[PDB]
């Protein structure tokens, strides 16, 4: 008895099982649709430090997957390469059908070592991990996924009104992270600017900030040196908060731009 | 409304598999067709905030039932939920012994 939403006159009335309302008309199975809506649209924190907290590892529960016919572009998607600290596999390899989430503005690729208590990784929020029209309850290794929930819809009159046209470019950038103690409270992440330069990661940092940081490091960060890989603590030294608003929020406009000079860098050690 | 939920995204940018009717070229053929990445299509439903927002709420609500249904089922891969909803709809409206002028049966004279 999953709730089946009925769209009438561009208004969403969830259906009533017992009522068998005469009005609603299901002409064909085309009208039936499953929609996978991302969590990022729900106002949840979407940065990898906070997002990892919602994911969790448990064992003794079999993984399940569902198909969602249509999905929403996700600003942030995550690809995990977690391995156990001895190098053992932590996340199950993707089954043949499973493929990466189709449309992602920012792919957060986390490769690192973490305690891996459970056989599989599950979403503590109850949501599904969306993979290319397949919604799973378990994280699969090395496949881009966007955490989301699946909604089932009865589309209106199949008159091309909904999901057939835009009533009214795909460029995906990979933000590569490295993590230790993945899946525990004591987790630390390093944003990987390049092979030799890493930046300590905090929740405040947004993907736009991280890309700007990458540019700033490249232009004037003296990233290349013989000392070794450099881990930099970074703080935007601007009075306003960094990326409080969500991606949709205020169309991300009139947003203060943190010129390269504002960012402050110190070497952790 | 969706203020129970902390933030509702006003814009819905949806990616979906292409419609069967639109494609006419010799790209249906798998060999000559688009790769997995290219099959998708795009849309934006920004104009109507109320429907899409309600929709996010509906998805948050339905996830509980979906999870329980998955727990009960033994399906490794479940693709029959929509069909089961369809058969439920038909079985419900037209299960049988439906009065010609009754609440149970949709049929209406003339």
């Amino acid at each position, epitope marked *: *008895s999953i*709730p*089946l*939403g009925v769209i009438h006159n561009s208004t*969403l009335q*969830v*259906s*009533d099982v017992d009522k068998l309302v005469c009005r609603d008309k299901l002409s064909s199975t085309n009208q039936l649709r499953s929609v996978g809506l991302n969590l990022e649209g729900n106002g949840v924190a979407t940065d990898v430090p906070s997002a990892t907290k919602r994911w969790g590892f448990r064992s003794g529960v079999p993984p399940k997957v569902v198909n969602y016919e249509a999905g929403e572009w996700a600003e942030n998607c995550y690809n995990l390469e977690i391995k156990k600290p001895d190098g053992s596999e932590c996340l199950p390899a993707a089954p043949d059908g499973i493929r990466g989430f189709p449309r992602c503005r920012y792919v957060h690729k986390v490769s690192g070592t973490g305690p891996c208590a459970g056989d599989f990784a599950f979403h503590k929020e109850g949501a599904f991990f969306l993979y290319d029209r397949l919604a799973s309850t378990v994280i699969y290794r090395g496949t881009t996924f966007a955490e989301g929930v699946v909604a089932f819809l009865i589309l209106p009159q199949a008159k091309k009104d909904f999901f057939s046209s835009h009533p009214l470019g795909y460029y995906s950038t990979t933000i590569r992270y490295q993590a230790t103690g993945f899946g525990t409270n004591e987790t630390e992440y390093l944003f990987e600017v390049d092979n030799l330069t890493y930046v300590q990661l905090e929740s405040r940092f947004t993907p736009q900030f991280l890309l700007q940081l990458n540019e700033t490091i490249y232009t004037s960060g003296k990233r290349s040196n013989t000392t070794g890989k450099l881990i930099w603590k970074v703080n935007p030294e601007i009075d306003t908060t960094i990326g409080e608003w969500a991606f949709w929020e205020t169309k991300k406009n009139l947003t203060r731009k943190i010129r390269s000079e504002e960012l402050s860098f110190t070497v952790v050690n | *409304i*969706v*203020n*129970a*939920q902390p933030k509702c995204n006003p814009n819905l940018h949806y990616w979906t598999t292409q419609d069967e009717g639109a494609a006419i070229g010799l790209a249906w053929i798998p060999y000559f067709g688009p790769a997995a990445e290219g099959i998708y299509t795009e849309g934006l439903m920004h104009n109507q905030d109320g429907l899409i927002c*309600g929709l996010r*709420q*509906l998805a948050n*609500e*339905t996830t*509980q*039932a979906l999870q329980l249904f998955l727990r009960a089922t033994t399906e490794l891969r479940t693709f029959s939920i929509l069909n089961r909803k369809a058969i439920d709809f038909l079985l419900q409206r037209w299960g049988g012994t439906c009065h010609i002028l009754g609440p149970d049966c949709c049929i209406e004279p003339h």
Partner: antibody
Amino acid sequence: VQLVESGGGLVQPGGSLRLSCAASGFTSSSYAMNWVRQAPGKGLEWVSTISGMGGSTYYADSVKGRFTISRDNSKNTLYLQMNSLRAEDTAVYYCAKRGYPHSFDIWGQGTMVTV
Amino acid sequence: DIQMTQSPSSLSASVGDRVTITCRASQSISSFLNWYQQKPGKAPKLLIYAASSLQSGVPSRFSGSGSGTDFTLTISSLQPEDFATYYCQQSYSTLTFGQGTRL
């Protein structure tokens, strides 16, 4: 910020009663409101809950087939249609809103139903 | 199903004292216990979000303690308004309440 309950009264064993819980200061449509029944001197038990939009209706074991609960989101009102009332149902009923562990957080003033 | 038991059915203490009220679950619930304070004759008020988290606007003196199977609530200073009865609710399955505890 306020939940108001109504419809309580005297009903003979059997029969039906409708309990109306109305939301003031909240858009009830958004939140999943719940009904909790406190028997006099015998503690609290949860009787039913609804999803925000009304798609999911959930009932306790005792009233699984007896109570029908529905929400009119337009009026920010919740209706609990008690039916086939039994002797033990003679208790005050509270309507509350869901929380982090399915936790009733804002409690409207209880109404008394007597059989 | 799981059965909720508050160990102290009733206990009496003076103001300014340390008191712990314990609610025990027959089977472990993953920190899904929330506490309710019911003033006598008034609708219950939520206290602890889930085992430890303290509801906004509830006095900080109330402290939520949580564990896998056994949960406790401690009142720091026993002000007179806090002398009212308390309840424990599980959220693992069926949302049962423990038998109320009387101060």
